[PDB]
Structure formats: C-alpha cells, structure tokens
Amino acid sequence: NQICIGKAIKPINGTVETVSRMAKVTGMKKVGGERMQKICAKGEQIHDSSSACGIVSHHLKQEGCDFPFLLNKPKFATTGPMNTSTTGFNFYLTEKAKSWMNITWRVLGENKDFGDNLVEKYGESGATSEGATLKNYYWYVPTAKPGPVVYEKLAECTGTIYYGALLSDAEAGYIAVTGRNVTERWDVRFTGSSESSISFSGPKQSPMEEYIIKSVRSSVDTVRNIIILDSGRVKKGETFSISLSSGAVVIPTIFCDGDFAVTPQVQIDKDCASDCHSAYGSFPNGSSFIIHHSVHTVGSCPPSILRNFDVIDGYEATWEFFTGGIQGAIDGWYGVTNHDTGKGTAADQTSTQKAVEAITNKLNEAIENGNQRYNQLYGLARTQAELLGNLGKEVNDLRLETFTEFIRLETILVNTRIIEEHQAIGSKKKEEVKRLLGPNALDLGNGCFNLTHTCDSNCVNSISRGTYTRENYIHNVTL
Amino acid sequence: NQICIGKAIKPINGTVETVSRMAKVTGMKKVGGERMQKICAKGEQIHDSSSACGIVSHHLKQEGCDFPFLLNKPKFATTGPMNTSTTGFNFYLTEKAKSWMNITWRVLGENKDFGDNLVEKYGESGATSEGATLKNYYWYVPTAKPGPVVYEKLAECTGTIYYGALLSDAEAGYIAVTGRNVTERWDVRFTGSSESSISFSGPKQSPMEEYIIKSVRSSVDTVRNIIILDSGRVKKGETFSISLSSGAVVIPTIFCDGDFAVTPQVQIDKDCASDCHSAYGSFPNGSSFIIHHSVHTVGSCPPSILRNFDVIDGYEATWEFFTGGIQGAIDGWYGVTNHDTGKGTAADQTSTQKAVEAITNKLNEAIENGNQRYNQLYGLARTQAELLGNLGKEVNDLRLETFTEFIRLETILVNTRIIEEHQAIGSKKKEEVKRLLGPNALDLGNGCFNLTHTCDSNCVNSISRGTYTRENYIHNVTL
Amino acid sequence: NQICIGKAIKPINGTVETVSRMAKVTGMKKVGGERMQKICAKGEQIHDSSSACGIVSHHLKQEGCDFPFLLNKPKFATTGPMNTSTTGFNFYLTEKAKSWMNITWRVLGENKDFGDNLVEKYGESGATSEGATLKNYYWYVPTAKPGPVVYEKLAECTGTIYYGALLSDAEAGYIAVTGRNVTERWDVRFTGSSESSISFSGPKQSPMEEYIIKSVRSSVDTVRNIIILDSGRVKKGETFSISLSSGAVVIPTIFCDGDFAVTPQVQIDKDCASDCHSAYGSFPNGSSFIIHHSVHTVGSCPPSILRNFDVIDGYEATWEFFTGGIQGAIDGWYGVTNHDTGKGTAADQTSTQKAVEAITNKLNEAIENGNQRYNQLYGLARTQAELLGNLGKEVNDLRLETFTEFIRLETILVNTRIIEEHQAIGSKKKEEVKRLLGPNALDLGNGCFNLTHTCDSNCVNSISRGTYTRENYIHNVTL
Numbered sequence A, B, C: 001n002q003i004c005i006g007k008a009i010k011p012i013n014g015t016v017e018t019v020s021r022m023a024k025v026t027g028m029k030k031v032g033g034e035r036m037q038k039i040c041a042k043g044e045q046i047h048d049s050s051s052a053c054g055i056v057s058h059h060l061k062q063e064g065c066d067f068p069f070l071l072n073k074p075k076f077a078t079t080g081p082m083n084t085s086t087t088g089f090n091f092y093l094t095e096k097a098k099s100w101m102n103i104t105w106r107v108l109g110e111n112k113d114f115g116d117n118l119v120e121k122y123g124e125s126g127a128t129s130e131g132a133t134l135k136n137y138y139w140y141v142p143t144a145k146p147g148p149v150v151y152e153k154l155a156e157c158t159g160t161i162y163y164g165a166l167l168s169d170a171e172a173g174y175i176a177v178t179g180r181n182v183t184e185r186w187d188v189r190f191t192g193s194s195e196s197s198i199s200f201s202g203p204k205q206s207p208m209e210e211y212i213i214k215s216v217r218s219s220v221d222t223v224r225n226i227i228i229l230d231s232g233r234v235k236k237g238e239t240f241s242i243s244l245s246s247g248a249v250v251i252p253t254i255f256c257d258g259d260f261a262v263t264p265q266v267q268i269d270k271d272c273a274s275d276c277h278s279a280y281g282s283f284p285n286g287s288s289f290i291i292h293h294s295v296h297t298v299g300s301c302p303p304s305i306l307r308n309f310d311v312i313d314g315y316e317a318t319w320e321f322f323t324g325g326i327q328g329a330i331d332g333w334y335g336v337t338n339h340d341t342g343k344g345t346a347a348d349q350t351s352t353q354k355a356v357e358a359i360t361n362k363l364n365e366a367i368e369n370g371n372q373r374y375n376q377l378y379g380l381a382r383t384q385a386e387l388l389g390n391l392g393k394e395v396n397d398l399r400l401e402t403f404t405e406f407i408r409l410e411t412i413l414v415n416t417r418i419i420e421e422h423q424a425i426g427s428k429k430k431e432e433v434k435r436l437l438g439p440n441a442l443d444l445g446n447g448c449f450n451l452t453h454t455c456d457s458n459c460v461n462s463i464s465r466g467t468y469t470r471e472n473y474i475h476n477v478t479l
C-alpha cells in the first residue's frame, strides 16, 4: 500500500491578505477590541455636581466645588457647562482659556499652590466683599499705584496657570483700583514655555467695553466686579514670569498635567468591572488595541486605532486524488493516513503545537513593534492633558491615522510571516518522515510515499509516534 | 516525440520593480496621466475682466464687477491684480485678507447675504457720497457714539467674512464719525471658527498713519475715505460674533467654501473637450491619477501625484534547449508546441484571458486602495478653497509627498501581486495538462512531456482544445 | 563516486530580518556610523570669545566682537551667554529675537549691509554718546517728528533682520526723541516673508515699564538708553517693508541663511582629522548615515538617523548527510567536494565575486533611495539655519522619526533582495554544472551528482575551472 501526511480538511472560514496574495484560511480573528454599549463602573466612585457648580467655580474654590483639591479624585466626573454663573463676581475667559479650562478642572494629579510666595513677596492680597464665597485668587493692589513689578518663580510641575485682571465696570472704582487714566491701555504678560498677553483699558474704552458686554453675569445682580482671565503654560524645571500692575489678578495654583477624568455620555452600569473606559463605553479585558477615535481614556488602556483588521487564527487551506488534505476526521491540524478513514488515520500533536506557538509568537512580536511605533509617534514622556489641550478644538488627530496605517501594514506582514512559518514546519516534518522511512521506497513528490510492502492501520499508527521499524514489514513485495 | 507548453517568446520591453527583485517584462505603462500643452475649453464659458475690475472691486459689488453674484459661474476666470484701484474709496488689506481674497473672489458656490439682518437689528447703514458706485458694505454709525455692541449670528455655510473699519484721513471727519478721542486706540474683534482682531486710532496716530501711507489710492483723487479690512472664518452650524463700534464696517456676505475658478496661464484652445483642467493645461480622459503639484483643479479630476511610476502591462520574460519559451509565433501569450514551427504550434486563449483579467483586477484594487488613502489623508468633507486658503503662501504640500510615496509602494506591491498571479496560472495550467495527459508518460520537470508514442502535428492541436484521447495514439513505442 | 557543490560551512554570526522571516547569517554590519568621544579639529581654526563678548555684542559690531563680519569664519565658535552685558546701552530682546540670535551670530555665509541706502534715503543717523563703542545700528530721528514713513527694499538674500526702538527711560528724553505724548501707544511693523510688530509707549506706561524692568543693564551704570529689538524674515527675490517713526531703530544688515558654526561641548583634540563634526563629537570617514539627533553639523556630512540597524555582510546559513554545506575548509564562499577533505575540495572564485558584487550594488541602491527620500522630506534648497530657527525651542524633529522608520524598512528590503540574489546565483551555478556534466548521470535533487564512474580528486578539481571532459573518465561502471 502507501501512506500520506498532510493537513486536516476543514471548511474555509475566510480570506486574509498577505504581502503578495490573498490566502484562504480556516480561522481568523481581529486585532483590536470593540467598544461596549455601557460603562462598567463597579468599584469606582462617580462625581456629579452639574446642579450646583460650573467649570469656573471649581478653579476659584467656590463653596461646595472643590474637585481640583480633593484627596482622592474619582475617574468619572460631571459638572455644569462653561457658561454657568458663579456666586462671586462676573467672569470673562478668552478662547484659549476656555479650551484649557475644559480640561484643567478634572486633572487627576496633584496641584501645586504658590499663593504664600506671592503673599510674602508683595503683602496681603486685595480684599472685596463680592468675593467672600470664592477663595483661590490673589489680587495685586499695592499702596503706590500702578507700581509695576515682574514676578518670577521656578515651577514645580508642568501645567497651566490662569492670570489676568479683576476690575469694576464703574469709572470711579477702576480709577481707585488701577491708579491709571481711563484713556490708557495696559498689558499683563506671561512668559513660560510660551508667551501670552492680555490688554485692558477703562470701562468706556476698548477693549474693556467688549469684556463687559460679553461677560457672564453672576447670581447676585448687585455685583459689579468682572474677572478677566487668560492662560499660560509652564514647564517643570524652568522659571516663569508674570508682569504685574495694580489691579492684576492671578489664580495661585499650577494645574499639573497628567490624566483627567472622563465625563460619561452613555448609561453607567454597576455590578460590572473593567479596566479600560471611555466617554462612550468600556472595552474588553486584555485587548492589544482598542477601536477609539482619541487618546483620552481612564484606567489601563492600550493604544487606539481607528478601524479593525483581520489576522490569521488557523492555517491556509491548500487543497481543492491526494491534494494535501486528509478526508478522515482527526483531533488536530496534521495527520497521517493510508486512504482508510475511521481508524487508520492518526494525528500528530507536535506539528499542531508548533503551529499554535508560531502564531502566538508572531502576534506578540507584532504587538511589540506596534507599541514601539506608538511610543515613537507620541513620545515616552507624554500626558493626555497636554495632548488634548494642544489639539484644541480640532477633533481629528493625524497621528492616529498614521498609526492605523502602520498597524494595517503590520497585520499584513504578520499574516505573511505566519504562513511562511507554517510552510517551513510542514516541509521539515515531511523531510523528517522521509528520513525515518528509508531509501527503499520512492517519493511521489506530493507528500505521499509508496512502500515496497503493504502498510496496514498498525503500520500507519506506528509511524506517527516514530517507533516504526522496518524489520517486521519487509515481507511480501508490491509496487 | 514530445510536447511542451509555455509562453510566447517576445522582445523584452523593460524592467519593473517588485518587492524582492527587478523583473524584465515585455510591456509596461504608467499609472498617472501627463499634463497637456493647452486647455481644452470647448463647451465652457470664459470670464475675463482684467481691463476694468480688480479683486477688491468684485467683493464690493462695483458697477460691472459681479462675479461672486452671478447665477452661472464660469470655470475659467481672470481679473486685474490685487493692487488694482477701485472707483469708490481707497482700501487697505491685511496679509491674511490678501491671501483669502486671492481665492474668495472666484468661488463657484452660492454666497449667503445677511445685510438685512444687520439693517433690521441696528438701522440704516451710514451713507457717504464717495461710495455711490459700490453696493456691498454696511457702515455702522449709531446716533449715540461710540455705542459699542456685539453682533451674533448663526452661520448658514462654512466660509469667510471681511470686516474692519471705514474712516477718513482728516481729524474732523474721524472725530465726527467715531466719536472718540484721537489719542485712543480701539479694536474690532471677530470670533468664529478662529479669532481675529484689528486696531485703529486717529489719523495722526499709530497705526492709522501706516494705513494711510500703505493704502491703494482710488481713481478719483478727491476721495478721502479708506476702508481697512481683515478676514475671519465661520463654520456652518456654529454662531459667530463681531464687536462693533461707531465707524466699523462689515461686508454682509459669507463667501462659502467649495471649488473656485482656474485662471488660465497657457493657450486656451476651443474645438477640444476634456473633463479635468488645471492652470497649466488639461489632462487625458479617464486617468486614475494626474501628475499635478496641487489639489486645485476644475471638472471631474482624480487624485494628484508629484511623479509617475511604471506598472506591468505584459508578462515576465523567464527565458534565456527548452527554457520556458516557444520560438514559433502564436496569437496569444501561452502555447503548446512540439519543436515544430509553422503549423504544429497552437496557442490557448484561456490562459491569456486569465492573465489579462488578473492584471485588470489587481490594478483596480490598487486604485481603490489609493483612493482610500487619499480620503484618509485629506478628509471626506473637504473643499479646495479651504485647503488652498489654509496653505497660504506655502507652495509645498507635504500630504502630496506622503501620497506619492504611498503610491510608489502600492505600485511595487501591484507588480509583485501580478507576477505571482501569473505564476499561479501557469502552474495550474501545467498541472491540468499533466492530469489530462496520463500516468504512462514521464515529466522532465521543465514543462516538456515525453510521450511513449509519436505526437504529430494533429496530436498537438488535439491537446490544446482538451479533446485529446489516448486510444488512437497508443500504436508504436518510443522513448 | 559522486560530487557535490555548495557553500562553505562557517560559524553563524547573527540574525537579520527580512520581509517574511528572520535569517541566520555568517556576517553582518551596521548602516550608520557612531559618534566619537572627541572632536577632531586638525587643520581647523577655533574661535573663542566667551571672556569678552556676548551674543548681542556681535550683532552690534562692538569693539573686539566681529564674528559676523570676518573674512574667513571658523567652523567652531564659542561666546558668552545671551544675558551678557555690552559696553553700549542696555538691551531687551523678545523671545523670537532670542531664538534667532542664538543662531544668527555664527552664520558662516556672507552678510549683506544696507545702511548706506537708509542714510541716503533719510539722512544721517541719530547720534548719542552712549553708543560710541558700537557701530552697527541706524537711528531714525527726523527733523519733523514723529514723521512716519515706510521703508521698502528689495532683499539680496534670505535671512533675518533685527528692528525695533532705542529709547531713554526718562520722560524728558523720550519726549525729545519721539515727539509723541507719553499716554500714546505706537507700533513698529515689519512685513517680509511673514509679519512682525512691536509696541512702545512712555517710560511710565505699559509696556515700556516692563521693558525697563526686564532689560539687561550695561557695564557702565550711567547709561540710560535701552534698545528693544524684534526680528523679521526676508526672502531673496522679494521686497520687505518697515514702518518707521521717530525714535525707531534698525540693524542695517541681513544675516543670510546657510550653515552656522558648532559650539564644542566635548574635548577638542588636535593631531586628528575628520570631515563630519557635531557638538558632541566627530564621525568616521565615509559613512552613509550618522547616528545624530539633529541636522546641525559642519563639514561634509551624510543624512542623520536616530538609531542603528543591521545589514547582511555574508550569506545565509542554510544547513543543519549532505545539507548544502561543505565540511572541508576552502578559500571562498562556494566549493565543490567529493566527501574528501584536505585536497579533493576546490573552491570557485566566480560565485564569491558575484555575491560580493551583489551585496555592494544592493547597498548602493539602498543608499541612493534613502538620499532621495531625505531630499523629498527636507527639500532640495534647504539651509541648516532656517530649519533650526523654525524649530525654535523644540528639540524633537518629527521628520527625523519618519526618516528613521523609512531607513528601517529599507534595510529590511535590502536584506530580502540580497538573499534573493544569492539564491538566484546559486541556482544558476547548479544549472550550469548540470548542463556541463552530462545527461548520463542522475541528480539527487540536493546539489549532489552521482556519476556512472569513479571520480578521484583530480576529476573534482577539473570540474571547478570548467575544463572537464568526459572522454578520459568513461572507464569502469558503478552506481
């Protein structure tokens, strides 16, 4: 008779893309994990103050709004919109200040305060009765006005600082506080990692009239003071400077960069745990990549891609007379048969184990390469707050597109590598079988060996374990 | 005798580049189409007003210059340079305003007007006798001056708006119109998709003196008014705001984004039609890509690349004793011979048809991939006007370089895939021939089969159409 | 007997990465050259003035500090820090001015002067006794003040120009020079390749008070004048304009772009020569790429990459019965044996020479492709000064990361191509040997040929040079 070695015939599950062709495979999966329909927040605390506080109220430490100063900060937080009024004075924010305040109120790090340094350098802060509820502000009102100074300080962390002015909308109060003429225009300048500036004038002159018109009015209608704020950026090891004159104001806190909380936009479900969450749902455990449109997430999360890709999970179907496949059912991926089905077909676990190990190792190497590329693209020392703030109002990140293209190319390369490794394993197994069999028989060049004798089911079964011997099968002659 | 199957010998036309090697091929073509030496403008209207109008005159709706308000806008348009004087007042434009006005005067979309809203909100516009020829402007001159306000409106389309001031160069007129003091400095601010601002002062104070010196004088030498203009951007669904004081001016029209006309720079030829045009010539019909240095074009145009690449159009020349080639001439790419030339060599159309179909399908898949990459690079909702305006004075687009590199890699991949598919077709044909022939004969391992009998001229022809039978050829024995 | 042809067995040196697998090779090297521990400055002059001059002193042509006006400019230069005082007036620089002055004081090109044009256009420059030591400045003080003008000039080279004001910190001097009121705010504007502006006011008004506080005091404590400077950029063929008023100042020199000197940061070693230097060490001669984190270098330097990669330098080890390897030692890479070691094994130099040439040619093509990609990424007409100035305070260049990724991919492709070419050479050699031998013998399909006769060592070496003939070996019969 004769024997053959090959793969187990299984239904074709799909098609994957290699470098030079498309291959039909018996099994495939997806590299990235898909978003769920809810947020699994078991074991996590949720902060919600949308009915009592606004974004600005948190920065100024209003009574009952102290998220940036909590000892333990919840990963999920919600609050009122940007235009929510406070109980103190009226406020105005620039566009840059709005963009950065959308983030800085919910940073999960530890914030640094430098109000005591200002107090000891320039004396006690100015006092007004309209800001009794708020606490976190320093008002520079020297005895001799305007009395310009430049305040320099070495920062303790990378972050943002809000500065500006606090002025009345009446001419008498403005003159009493600033000590300038109404027709004059003056500036407050900030020099840190970058440069920022803001201009002020009298209540009936530009641009202060526009500030008055555009300001957000407070809950108390008798309050005349408006606090106008801009933002500046500071680096950890460098020094920053602020040009101060009478009437200038500064919030004496550095809002350090890092992770910041996620505002839930979908249903929050308890009695369900996870480790990677986003504003629109959680992700399955142990994902190599996640299908997300941003880098903002909480918990332990992998890199994000914009779309999913298919990777091989089985083996190529290289079959339609022997054509490499084995009709008989076997418990494995490779087998030895003698055209007898039911008991004369035996499978070898060694080749299947090798193929599974090859798939695992190639996938691990691919994931490592992708992580290295992600680190190169975004940087080793990166923070989500800084990236999101620098993006600004833009919702499209080009680095995500570059990373997605790289991941697609990597997936194609992985499919190619896995297929080639499987081919090498099969060729090595065939060569080993030919070596073990003997030189007497001849090879048909397709994995089937014709023996000089008859090979019963026991002869086939002995070959798979490798204990086959030629002595007991020499009898009789056939071709 | 014996028979052989193989490819038709043809002269080598060139060399293409694959992933792992360079392959010699009998035919190749180019992916992209080349620019022509003229513009084919049959069936298209051409606008030319360079002898009577300038760029600014079109925006202000000067008598005889109304391109942005035409019902049907020609695809080709020419007009005077930016420094062309108008018949109204003198004008001054910022650098950003100049850059955006180079584009906005020839947008092919429909522009939105909001002058009636301004009139009903604030009353009739201010009137001067020096602007009788121009129509498209609103001059905010309230009864009580300065009377600052903030005008907010929800936009109807994404586009640009030109704002600023309209002031005299005499102190008396400036004081009468603005109602301010000459020593004061005031601002006009625009808040839309971004932020813009511009400053004004008295005629003898900075920066108004520089505006007077740098202004473009009008045709009438008795005109004292100067209109100073800056630009701002608005998004479709969002609201925009302008800070207005007495003396401020605004052009009450949103110049919507989209396609804009092309100014011809080469000879215009009628009696010749095309569908893709550029400023330096037209392009051939039905091109997958065009060799262009920008994304600005009119008509139906494909993506543009910076240089051309070669793609395979024939088959690889895998020949220098039989070496895979067939000496005898045949009407196809594949054939069967018996070392007899003239009638005993027969060609099979099936393999040639399969190879041509493979080339076509691979090229189509490549073009689809390139289109997807282009959409990812530039965005699904993109307009030529916005891209060109954001580019500014820069003439080098990095996205074009990235796309060209991607297209080069794609072309290499396509060559590899086509060559592999041709190899697979050839191997399948050889296996089918071996199966059809029979087990009696032996294979030399190079596509040539030695028969046990003689194969005459009719025997070769019988094999080609697949009706070959063994019964009538068993007679006689040879090796 | 029998003969075999194959590769010489050598110890495995390493593993390289190809497109679809990792290959074990007998030799590999690195694409890029590594930085040395010293600067080899034999035959080069070194400039050092850190004990007498500062950066600003060089621009103003202070007595003894004239690097930008030297006939021959040394490639290595050192000077005092930016905050070094001068012997003239006090100075203040904006952040942009500081960033550009860090570079422009050491440009190696020829600088263009236009002071004579200013003198002939507007008369003799204003004179003060506090600037007797400095020479390179023009002070615009007309007879009728303020007397605003706009100065337009066609540039001669691409570069930077420093402009601004020169004012006293006393009210009387400010009024006498400017001719303005103290409460007014005025601007100096620069229009070139981009737009720049700077604002001034009275000594007791913003922002001049901040300039006074932040200024760097001069060596002489009786000097009251402060020169406040900003920077602007000019292109070669275009015209630039400056808005000048009484009291404005401008440095009448265009600091042309190009290469600029390197400040040594490591030990300088003479009696040692090189052609590529950086601030932290030199590089070996004749390197295709250098491991550097920037594009700033002096001498003839190749493109820089951020990390090194391995390229093949030998051949793949395709061996563990004959398995393609030859046990006997030979003087080459390929050989012919008859299982007799010591004298019956002969090597062929043709295949080894072909393999070495293939390696060289593939590496050269790779280097050419990398150079083309570098030129596309950075531009054909580029200068180091412009790139470094546009980078600013950023120390991470993304184009370097893109180039490094491209070089990694290119190295993988080169390994693949070299291995494929070696395989082709081996297959061609085997086919030629089979053709030369004869049809009588049979092939075992593994590079070993069994002859019908015995083959002594003489029969073996006769094959190597190809003068083998069958006539003298027909005698005797064996299998």
Ligand SMILES: *[C@@H]1O[C@H](CO)[C@@H](O[C@@H]2O[C@H](CO)[C@@H](O[C@@H]3O[C@H](CO[C@@H]4O[C@H](CO)[C@@H](O)[C@H](O[C@@H]5O[C@H](CO)[C@@H](O)[C@H](O)[C@@H]5O[C@@H]5O[C@H](CO)[C@@H](O)[C@H](O)[C@@H]5O)[C@@H]4O)[C@@H](O)[C@H](O)[C@@H]3O)[C@H](O)[C@H]2NC(C)=O)[C@H](O)[C@H]1NC(C)=O
Pocket: A035, A082, A102, A103, A279, A280, A291, A292, A293, A294, A296, A305, A306, A307, A388, A395, A396, A397
């Ligand atoms: C303070 O800072 C916050 C954080 O920066 C700001 O949050 C952003 O607010 C935006 C305005 O509300 C918001 O934009 C909305 O996003 C919604 C997203 O939900 C969608 O769900 C769909 C399915 O139901 C998806 O189809 C859709 O888009 C997909 O996203 C996938 C990833 O999940 C991608 O793989 C897919 O390709 C697909 O398409 C992407 O869409 C992206 C835009 O969402 C786009 O950038 C990307 O290129 C792909 O094209 C999406 O998942 C939409 O339903 C809304 O219509 C609207 O677009 C941002 O998502 C918020 N960002 C984050 C990180 O939370 C907050 O606004 C700010 N506050 C203020 C006052 O400024």
Ligand SMILES: *[C@@H]1O[C@H](CO)[C@@H](O[C@@H]2O[C@H](CO)[C@@H](O[C@@H]3O[C@H](CO[C@@H]4O[C@H](CO)[C@@H](O)[C@H](O[C@@H]5O[C@H](CO)[C@@H](O)[C@H](O)[C@@H]5O[C@@H]5O[C@H](CO)[C@@H](O)[C@H](O)[C@@H]5O)[C@@H]4O)[C@@H](O)[C@H](O)[C@@H]3O)[C@H](O)[C@H]2NC(C)=O)[C@H](O)[C@H]1NC(C)=O
Pocket: B035, B082, B102, B103, B279, B280, B291, B292, B293, B294, B296, B305, B306, B307, B388, B395, B396, B397
């Ligand atoms: C209002 O907006 C308009 C649109 O934004 C502005 O139009 C631009 O005006 C510029 C100044 O007039 C103009 O620059 C000129 O371009 C000419 C182009 O013609 C050349 O023809 C040559 C053959 O005869 C080509 O060799 C040459 O360059 C090639 O272009 C090929 C594509 O066609 C490329 O594949 C090749 O690589 C090759 O090299 C490219 O050159 C590009 C620059 O042209 C460069 O960006 C690219 O990276 C490659 O290096 C070119 O085709 C030149 O002859 C002139 O010397 C000058 O460079 C722009 O082309 C105009 N742009 C468009 C889209 O029309 C208009 O200026 C503005 N008005 C104001 C007042 O600002």
Ligand SMILES: *[C@@H]1O[C@H](CO)[C@@H](O[C@@H]2O[C@H](CO)[C@@H](O[C@@H]3O[C@H](CO[C@@H]4O[C@H](CO)[C@@H](O)[C@H](O[C@@H]5O[C@H](CO)[C@@H](O)[C@H](O)[C@@H]5O[C@@H]5O[C@H](CO)[C@@H](O)[C@H](O)[C@@H]5O)[C@@H]4O)[C@@H](O)[C@H](O)[C@@H]3O)[C@H](O)[C@H]2NC(C)=O)[C@H](O)[C@H]1NC(C)=O
Pocket: C035, C082, C102, C103, C279, C280, C291, C292, C293, C294, C296, C305, C306, C307, C388, C395, C396, C397
């Ligand atoms: C006027 O202009 C000058 C030129 O623009 C400015 O010079 C810069 O000054 C900076 C501050 O002094 C200086 O930053 C320092 O750089 C040092 C570099 O020396 C290190 O040596 C180490 C080994 O001993 C390396 O490990 C290290 O980094 C490596 O660099 C390799 C290339 O040589 C890379 O292949 C490696 O990946 C590795 O990591 C890189 O680091 C880079 C930063 O150095 C980073 O950008 C890159 O992405 C890689 O991550 C480095 O070689 C450090 O020791 C110091 O700690 C500090 O970082 C800049 O290097 C100077 N730039 C140049 C071109 O000279 C000058 O500041 C300015 N003056 C003013 C007043 O502004």
Ligand SMILES: CC(=O)N[C@@H]1[C@@H](O)[C@H](O[C@@H]2O[C@H](CO)[C@H](O)[C@H](O[C@]3(C(=O)O)C[C@H](O)[C@@H](NC(C)=O)[C@H]([C@H](O)[C@H](O)CO)O3)[C@H]2O)[C@@H](CO)O[C@H]1O
Pocket: A126, A127, A128, A129, A130, A141, A167, A168, A172, A173, A174, A176, A177, A222, A223, A224, A225
């Ligand atoms: C009916 C009415 O509003 N009449 C006003 C009258 O209120 C106003 O007097 C000012 O009123 C405000 C009301 O909130 C404060 O009470 C002002 O007192 C203080 C304050 O505590 O806010 C005193 C404090 O010492 C001042 N601080 C500094 C640093 O100077 C501030 C400061 O002057 C102002 O807040 C300016 O921003 O004010 C009280 O003076 C008078 C103005 O004299 O005008 C009537 O029409």
Ligand SMILES: CC(=O)N[C@@H]1[C@@H](O)[C@H](O[C@@H]2O[C@H](CO)[C@H](O)[C@H](O[C@]3(C(=O)O)C[C@H](O)[C@@H](NC(C)=O)[C@H]([C@H](O)[C@H](O)CO)O3)[C@H]2O)[C@@H](CO)O[C@H]1O
Pocket: B126, B127, B128, B129, B130, B141, B167, B168, B172, B173, B174, B176, B177, B222, B223, B224, B225
């Ligand atoms: C010889 C000479 O020029 N003498 C001037 C004299 O012209 C000037 O009077 C002004 O002259 C201009 C000439 O174009 C206009 O006629 C001015 O009239 C108007 C106008 O432009 O129609 C009247 C109009 O009601 C005004 N509109 C508004 C909204 O206020 C404008 C406006 O005041 C000015 O255009 C300012 O921009 O002017 C006419 O007053 C006198 C100035 O009184 O000075 C002589 O030297």
Ligand SMILES: CC(=O)N[C@@H]1[C@@H](O)[C@H](O[C@@H]2O[C@H](CO)[C@H](O)[C@H](O[C@]3(C(=O)O)C[C@H](O)[C@@H](NC(C)=O)[C@H]([C@H](O)[C@H](O)CO)O3)[C@H]2O)[C@@H](CO)O[C@H]1O
Pocket: C126, C127, C128, C129, C130, C141, C167, C168, C172, C173, C174, C176, C177, C222, C223, C224, C225
């Ligand atoms: C003790 C003391 O400082 N008393 C000052 C007295 O110095 C000052 O007079 C000015 O002093 C400076 C000292 O460096 C110069 O000597 C001024 O002379 C000149 C100069 O040469 O610098 C004269 C020159 O013609 C002027 N140039 C122009 C273009 O106008 C300049 C110019 O006025 C100033 O430099 C302004 O920047 O000054 C000399 O006038 C007096 C002021 O009158 O004040 C005492 O308190």
Ligand SMILES: *[C@@H]1O[C@H](CO)[C@@H](O[C@@H]2O[C@H](CO)[C@@H](O)[C@H](O)[C@H]2NC(C)=O)[C@H](O)[C@H]1NC(C)=O
Pocket: A042, A043, A273, A274, A275, A285
């Ligand atoms: C996914 O990961 C989460 C971790 O966030 C798992 O939740 C933990 O499960 C272990 C084992 O049951 C418990 O001891 C922990 O108390 C759980 N954490 C919390 C916060 O409850 C979760 O089991 C994992 N598997 C899923 C969700 O299928």
Ligand SMILES: *[C@@H]1O[C@H](CO)[C@@H](O[C@@H]2O[C@H](CO)[C@@H](O)[C@H](O)[C@H]2NC(C)=O)[C@H](O)[C@H]1NC(C)=O
Pocket: B042, B043, B273, B274, B275, B285
């Ligand atoms: C290229 O495309 C243009 C379309 O712009 C073709 O011109 C049209 O040709 C058809 C068929 O002859 C006519 O019915 C149309 O009237 C033509 N259009 C116009 C505007 O005249 C042109 O024939 C195509 N082929 C070329 C140019 O070779």
Ligand SMILES: *[C@@H]1O[C@H](CO)[C@@H](O[C@@H]2O[C@H](CO)[C@@H](O)[C@H](O)[C@H]2NC(C)=O)[C@H](O)[C@H]1NC(C)=O
Pocket: C042, C043, C273, C274, C275, C285
């Ligand atoms: C590396 O290159 C340098 C050139 O910068 C070589 O130095 C020159 O060597 C030649 C030959 O000995 C001399 O004639 C020149 O005078 C040298 N130049 C200088 C400036 O001295 C150097 O020899 C090369 N090889 C090394 C450094 O190993």
Ligand SMILES: *[C@@H]1O[C@H](CO)[C@@H](O)[C@H](O)[C@H]1NC(C)=O
Pocket: A001, A002, A444, A450, A478, A479
């Ligand atoms: C292999 O052996 C079987 C029976 O022993 C025979 O039918 C078959 O033809 C043989 N294969 C070949 C290629 O001759």
Ligand SMILES: *[C@@H]1O[C@H](CO)[C@@H](O)[C@H](O)[C@H]1NC(C)=O
Pocket: A012, A013, A014, A027
């Ligand atoms: C492939 O296998 C999966 C099992 O994970 C199955 O859900 C899917 O339907 C299969 N696809 C086909 C085409 O049979």
Ligand SMILES: *[C@@H]1O[C@H](CO)[C@@H](O)[C@H](O)[C@H]1NC(C)=O
Pocket: A081, A082, A083, A084
């Ligand atoms: C405040 O903002 C919210 C959403 O940003 C908006 O719905 C609301 O109308 C705003 N309130 C006012 C008074 O404009």
Ligand SMILES: *[C@@H]1O[C@H](CO)[C@@H](O)[C@H](O)[C@H]1NC(C)=O
Pocket: A179, A180, A181
């Ligand atoms: C305001 O200006 C006048 C002169 O214009 C001046 O006398 C007065 O001192 C100025 N006001 C202050 C507070 O200095």
Ligand SMILES: *[C@@H]1O[C@H](CO)[C@@H](O)[C@H](O)[C@H]1NC(C)=O
Pocket: B001, B002, B444, B450, B478, B479
């Ligand atoms: C094939 O047959 C021809 C003649 O029938 C003969 O000359 C040739 O040697 C044969 N091929 C081989 C490999 O023996």
Ligand SMILES: *[C@@H]1O[C@H](CO)[C@@H](O)[C@H](O)[C@H]1NC(C)=O
Pocket: B012, B013, B014, B027
């Ligand atoms: C290749 O074929 C084209 C036909 O389109 C011909 O123009 C060209 O000259 C040929 N090239 C060579 C090298 O024969």
Ligand SMILES: *[C@@H]1O[C@H](CO)[C@@H](O)[C@H](O)[C@H]1NC(C)=O
Pocket: B081, B082, B083, B084
């Ligand atoms: C107007 O501009 C054109 C081209 O931009 C130029 O040739 C002409 O000299 C300019 N006219 C004036 C008066 O500057």
